[PDB]
Amino acid sequence: SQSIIAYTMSLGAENSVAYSNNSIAIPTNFTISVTTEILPV
Amino acid sequence: ANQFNSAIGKIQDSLFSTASALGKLQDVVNHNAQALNTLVKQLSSKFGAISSVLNDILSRLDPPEAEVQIDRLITGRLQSLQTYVTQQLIRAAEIRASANLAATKMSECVLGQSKRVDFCGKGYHLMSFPQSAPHGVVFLHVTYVPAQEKNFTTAPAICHDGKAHFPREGVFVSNGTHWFVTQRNFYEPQIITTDNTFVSGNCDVVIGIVNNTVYDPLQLELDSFKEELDKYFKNHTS
Amino acid sequence: SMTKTSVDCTMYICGDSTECSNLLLQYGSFCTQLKRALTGIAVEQDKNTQEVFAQVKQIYKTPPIKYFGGFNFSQILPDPSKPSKRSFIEDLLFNKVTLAFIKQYGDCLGDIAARDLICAQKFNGLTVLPPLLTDEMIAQYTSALLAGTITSGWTFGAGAALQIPFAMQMAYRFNGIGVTQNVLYENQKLIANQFNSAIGKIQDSLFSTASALGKLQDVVNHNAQALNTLVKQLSSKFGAISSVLNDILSRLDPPEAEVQIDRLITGRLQSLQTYVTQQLIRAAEIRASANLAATKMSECVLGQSKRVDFCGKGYHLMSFPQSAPHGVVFLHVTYV
Numbered sequence: 194s195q196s197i198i199a200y201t202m203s204l205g206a207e208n209s210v211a212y213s214n215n216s217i218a219i220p221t222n223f224t225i226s227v228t229t230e231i232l233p234v
Numbered sequence: 235a236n237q238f239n240s241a242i243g244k245i246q247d248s249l250f251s252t253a254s255a256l257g258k259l260q261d262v263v264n265h266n267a268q269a270l271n272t273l274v275k276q277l278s279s280k281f282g283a284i285s286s287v288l289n290d291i292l293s294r295l296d297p298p299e300a301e302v303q304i305d306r307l308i309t310g311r312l313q314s315l316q317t318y319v320t321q322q323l324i325r326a327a328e329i330r331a332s333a334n335l336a337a338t339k340m341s342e343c344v345l346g347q348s349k350r351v352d353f354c355g356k357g358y359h360l361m362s363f364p365q366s367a368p369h370g371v372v373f374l375h376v377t378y379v380p381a382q383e384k385n386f387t388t389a390p391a392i393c394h395d396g397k398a399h400f401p402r403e404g405v406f407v408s409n410g411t412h413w414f415v416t417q418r419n420f421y422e423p424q425i426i427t428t429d430n431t432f433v434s435g436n437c438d439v440v441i442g443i444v445n446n447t448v449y450d451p452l453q454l455e456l457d458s459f460k461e462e463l464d465k466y467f468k469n470h471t472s
Numbered sequence: 473s474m475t476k477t478s479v480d481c482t483m484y485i486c487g488d489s490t491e492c493s494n495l496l497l498q499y500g501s502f503c504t505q506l507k508r509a510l511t512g513i514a515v516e517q518d519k520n521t522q523e524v525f526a527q528v529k530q531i532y533k534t535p536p537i538k539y540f541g542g543f544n545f546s547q548i549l550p551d552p553s554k555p556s557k558r559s560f561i562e563d564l565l566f567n568k569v570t571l572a573f574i575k576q577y578g579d580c581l582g583d584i585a586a587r588d589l590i591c592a593q594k595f596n597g598l599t600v601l602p603p604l605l606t607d608e609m610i611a612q613y614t615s616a617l618l619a620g621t622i623t624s625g626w627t628f629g630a631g632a633a634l635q636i637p638f639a640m641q642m643a644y645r646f647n648g649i650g651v652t653q654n655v656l657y658e659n660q661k662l663i664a665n666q667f668n669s670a671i672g673k674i675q676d677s678l679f680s681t682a683s684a685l686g687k688l689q690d691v692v693n694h695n696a697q698a699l700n701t702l703v704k705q706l707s708s709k710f711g712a713i714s715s716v717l718n719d720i721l722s723r724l725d726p727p728e729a730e731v732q733i734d735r736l737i738t739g740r741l742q743s744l745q746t747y748v749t750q751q752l753i754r755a756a757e758i759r760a761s762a763n764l765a766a767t768k769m770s771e772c773v774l775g776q777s778k779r780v781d782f783c784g785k786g787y788h789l790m791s792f793p794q795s796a797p798h799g800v801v802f803l804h805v806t807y808v
């Protein structure tokens with residue numbers, strides 16, 4: 194059954210960057226992203 | 235082109251379903267309407283007088299006795315007007331700041347390509363398109379997002395002949411056995427070559443330098459031409 | 473951001489008095505306007521903090537090995553030996569800047585040494601709302617930003633964090649300012665030593681030379697001064713016989729008490745309006761500062777800036793954030 198719940202905020206998914214000591218990450222492919230911004234004038 | 239078309243097609247739904255944005259213009263409209271409603275509803279308050287209607291005070295009292303109630307109403311309504319004007323001035327300052335930002339975004343995102351991070355969208359800004367909205371502007375920011383990364387073994391320099399070679403514009407990568415030089419934003423590997431790198435000093439200074447052959451196009455072309463010339467000579471000399 | 477305050481209009485003007493409340497009903501929706509403005513200011517403060525700090529999709533973490541090419545980030549990386557994983561510099565900042573507000577002041581102290589300013593303010597309609605993001609959460613956001621910038625560079629600000637050795641990231645940053653990467657690769661130890669010495673001197677310079685770091689204290693002091701003036705205006709008579717509502721009610725009949733009640737009502741309404749107008753102006757100033765701080769986080773920390781003097785004096789290499797009470801601190805690493 195549905196109910197009102199209280200919790201602590203989740204700031205985000207914890208990602209451990211695989212920082213290595215002579216290793217790099219390079220992208221092999223891309224996307225074109227069209228985002229939107231609204232501004233009162 | 236297909237990716238841009240798909241994104242601009244999804245724009246027509248993301249602009250009205252995900253909420254988030256597009257509520258700022260509605261907030262402006264609601265704030266203005268609510269302020270006007272409060273100002274016009276402050277006219278039914280008495281502020282200590284016998285009535286909030288001026289005609290009733292003028293019709294039921296003598297001038298010297300009606301003047302007190304008239305002054306009470308004047309004080310209350312004047313205070314309401316100054317409150318409304320002050321809030322309008324503060325909101326106008328806020329809207330002017332927003333409009334200055336919008337003009338800057340039009341100049342730098344639409345009229346040019348911006349290297350300012352996150353100024354014209356999330357990612358590497360490509361371009362921007364303006365659209366008009368009631369009392370506002372909408373920027374469609376077209377940006378470049380690297381998608382499918384792969385991690386390689388990288389080195390700062392390559393040691394070939396007792397000399398350190400650094401990429402002209404790129405990064406040295408290794409897929410496990412061979413070493414290439416690529417561009418930092420898109421995996422396009424190429425053979426390490428004297429036209430791909432520049433020499434600076436010897437191999438005793440750089441931390442992390444590795445051995446790999448920097449192939450010289452001039453020397454190999456000269457050797458191939460000399461081999462062809464030797465074949466041409468042996469065609470008739472021997 | 474600044475302190476989120478709430479004012480009980482009826483309790484401030486006409487504390488637990490029904491005659492004064494009935495007389496205050498005749499002034500219209502002034503109390504509703506004041507409450508609406510204060511709620512907008514509080515929501516705006518939470519928004520300011522969110523825009524400045526919540527700029528990372530994920531909570532990035534540094535690897536267990538803390539070697540980054542000889543560069544020593546120990547004084548700015550999180551310290552796990554505390555309940556709040558705050559860095560050395562962040563702890564120093566939070567120690568120096570001391571708030572004057574909410575905690576759990578509902579059980580105010582039983583009058584041991586008079587009463588504090590906060591306890592007295594809380595007794596007449598003036599309360600403080602805690603911020604939505606705790607200092608632990610802000611420190612977590614700052615740590616995620618720092619880990620992302622020292623493990624990936626500017627890539628985590630434009631997509632997925634692509635790991636890169638810190639020496640090579642520094643080489644790219646050198647290329648960004650017009651200096652060849654062989655300059656860094658052949659002077660790597662010297663550059664690391666210079667950065668370590670500067671980051672060591674930062675601890676003394678932040679809290680000894682003063683200059684900056686007085687802005688957050690000024691914000692706190694201005695909020696406290698405004699609240700103190702608002703609570704001290706309750707002892708004014710404003711032309712009435714007594715400043716106490718109870719004395720006026722207990723000494724005069726309603727037809728003659730109402731005049732003094734209305735004098736007090738007018739004075740306290742004017743005080744509240746002045747307080748709220750000043751709060752709106754100060755909130756506009758703080759929002760301008762917060763938008764500037766968000767832009768600095770986006771263009772200095774998440775990437776390398778070519779704008780002159782935007783991210784420090786010299787040729788900008790990188791920047792590191794540190795949370796501070798109601799503010800942010802940017803450590804700008806530049807090339808001179």
Ligand SMILES: *[C@@H]1O[C@H](CO[C@@H]2O[C@@H](C)[C@@H](O)[C@@H](O)[C@@H]2O)[C@@H](O[C@@H]2O[C@H](CO)[C@@H](O)[C@H](O)[C@H]2NC(C)=O)[C@H](O)[C@H]1NC(C)=O
Pocket residue numbers: 409410411412414423424425
């Ligand atoms: C690592 O890469 C090498 C080289 O790849 C070649 O060059 C690249 C720039 C790209 O064009 C590749 O498609 C090329 O193959 C691989 O060595 C190659 O192996 C293939 C398969 O056996 C062979 O046909 C090629 O001749 C080889 N190239 C050379 C120069 O010898 C190597 O296998 C890759 N290693 C891994 C683990 O993927």
Ligand SMILES: *[C@@H]1O[C@H](CO[C@@H]2O[C@@H](C)[C@@H](O)[C@@H](O)[C@@H]2O)[C@@H](O[C@@H]2O[C@H](CO)[C@@H](O)[C@H](O)[C@H]2NC(C)=O)[C@H](O)[C@H]1NC(C)=O
Pocket residue numbers: 393443444445
């Ligand atoms: C990178 O190469 C140097 C240069 O040595 C040459 O290349 C080696 C692979 C080997 O074939 C040597 O005979 C060549 O002269 C390496 O330095 C050598 O190190 C070894 C081991 O200590 C030593 O016996 C050689 O005398 C060194 N050579 C010279 C000219 O001083 C170096 O070790 C190589 N680095 C890596 C990471 O493989």
Ligand SMILES: *[C@@H]1O[C@H](CO)[C@@H](O[C@@H]2O[C@H](CO)[C@@H](O)[C@H](O)[C@H]2NC(C)=O)[C@H](O)[C@H]1NC(C)=O
Pocket residue numbers: 221222223236237240381
């Ligand atoms: C780069 O990513 C794009 C977008 O995902 C890929 O394009 C898709 O390719 C798949 C597989 O062939 C198709 O089913 C989709 O229709 C394609 N999408 C679009 C928008 O064209 C592309 O293949 C990727 N590039 C590489 C080299 O893998």
Ligand SMILES: *[C@@H]1O[C@H](CO)[C@@H](O[C@@H]2O[C@H](CO)[C@@H](O)[C@H](O)[C@H]2NC(C)=O)[C@H](O)[C@H]1NC(C)=O
Pocket residue numbers: 209210211218383384385
């Ligand atoms: C880069 O290489 C690393 C190391 O192998 C990869 O990171 C691992 O990812 C797996 C799968 O999610 C995890 O189980 C491991 O814990 C990760 N390692 C570390 C050290 O965190 C990573 O996936 C590789 N990158 C790409 C693009 O494939």
Ligand SMILES: *[C@@H]1O[C@H](CO)[C@@H](O[C@@H]2O[C@H](CO)[C@@H](O)[C@H](O)[C@H]2NC(C)=O)[C@H](O)[C@H]1NC(C)=O
Pocket residue numbers: 214441537539
């Ligand atoms: C990255 O390579 C460097 C060498 O340039 C390593 O630094 C040494 O690491 C060993 C342990 O593996 C220590 O005993 C040395 O004291 C380190 N040297 C210095 C100058 O600090 C480094 O550990 C390597 N690996 C990682 C994971 O950082």
Ligand SMILES: *[C@@H]1O[C@H](CO)[C@@H](O[C@@H]2O[C@H](CO)[C@@H](O)[C@H](O)[C@H]2NC(C)=O)[C@H](O)[C@H]1NC(C)=O
Pocket residue numbers: 544545546547
């Ligand atoms: C990085 O800096 C820290 C300081 O933040 C160094 O820790 C110091 O180490 C010395 C030598 O042991 C001690 O005398 C100091 O008291 C330490 N300071 C603190 C705050 O713990 C640390 O050694 C540096 N790292 C490297 C690799 O040199």
